[PDB]
């Protein structure tokens, strides 16, 4: 199964100029495009190698449609400043995420479209793609305008249509890189923290996609106390990294096992300190 997602941010800049607009597109955990209103080109730009083969008609249409959205977001920053009774002095943010999911047969599974103001839920398209949920009374104004203009219909036509059709084509053109499941390369480190305690650190490196579980067990029972789990992080080469650490009584290392679950492991993997 696969996803395509776009991520839009507009930021008003009182004391600078027009709002900063930034767009990024993803297939699963791979970015393929960007647009930045401050960059010289004023164009949608390739960020993955398999999108470079699209012709100038692709780049012209994508640039026009994302610029149109940056204009809507500029007017929208003004409107929402009105709705919340805020001064022209302050900087405010509109975020938008949307996209579709397809199964391994390329068929529509799901659509999403969600909007935020100042880092908080504003309005969401419901999973039926026909109706909206507003976070507050300001967003209820938006919802009523969007019901009256039948905006749900244009979103449904995109998510069940162009969104799914173009994701399939992206998965075919990028098949050499986007269909890969790179399993984690694993190891364990040990550091004395005192004469009576030590840290075991369980590593997963070089994995794709990002979704992974590291769990520490003691005698077969899941262990949350005395652990640290860092956020999955990019290596910067297309792979991801994660680690999990547990503090253990010294000479009791053998009681602890680390479990690794990932799409690319046929059987789950268990690490124990030698």
């Amino acid at each position: 199964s696969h996803s395509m997602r776009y991520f839009y941010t507009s930021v008003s800049r009182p004391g600078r100029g027009e709002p900063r607009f930034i767009a990024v597109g993803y297939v699963d955990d791979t970015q393929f495009v960007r647009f930045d209103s401050d960059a010289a080109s004023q164009r949608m730009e390739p960020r993955a190698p398999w999108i470079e083969q699209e012709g100038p008609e692709y780049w012209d249409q994508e640039t026009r449609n994302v610029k149109a959205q940056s204009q809507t977001d500029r007017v929208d920053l003004g409107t929402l400043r009105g709705y919340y009774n805020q001064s022209e002095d302050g900087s405010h943010t509109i975020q938008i995420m949307y996209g579709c999911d397809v199964g391994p047969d390329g068929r529509f599974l799901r659509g999403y479209r969600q909007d935020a103001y100042d880092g908080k839920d504003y309005i969401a398209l419901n999973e039926d793609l026909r109706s909206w949920t507003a976070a507050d009374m300001a967003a209820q104004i938006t919802k009523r305008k969007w019901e009256a203009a039948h905006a749900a219909e244009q979103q449904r036509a995109y998510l069940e249509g162009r969104c799914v059709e173009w994701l399939r084509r992206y998965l075919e053109n990028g098949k050499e890189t986007l269909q890969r499941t790179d399993p984690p390369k694993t190891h364990m480190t040990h550091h004395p923290i005192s004469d009576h305690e030590a840290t075991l650190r369980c590593w997963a490196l070089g994995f794709y996609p990002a979704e992974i579980t590291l769990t520490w067990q003691r005698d077969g029972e899941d262990q949350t106390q005395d652990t640290e789990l860092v956020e999955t992080r990019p290596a910067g080469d297309g792979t991801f990294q994660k680690w999990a650490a547990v503090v253990v009584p010294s000479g009791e290392e053998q009681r602890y096992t680390c479990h690794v679950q990932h799409e690319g492991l046929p059987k789950p993997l268990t690490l124990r300190w030698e």
């Binding site: 776009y6 449609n65 007017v75 409107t79 305008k145 969104c163």
Partner: peptide, 10 residues
């Protein structure tokens, strides 16, 4: 590809 031009004001 991105959602088409004809978006609706908030």
């Amino acid at each position: 590809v991105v959602v088409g031009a004809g978006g609706v004001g908030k």
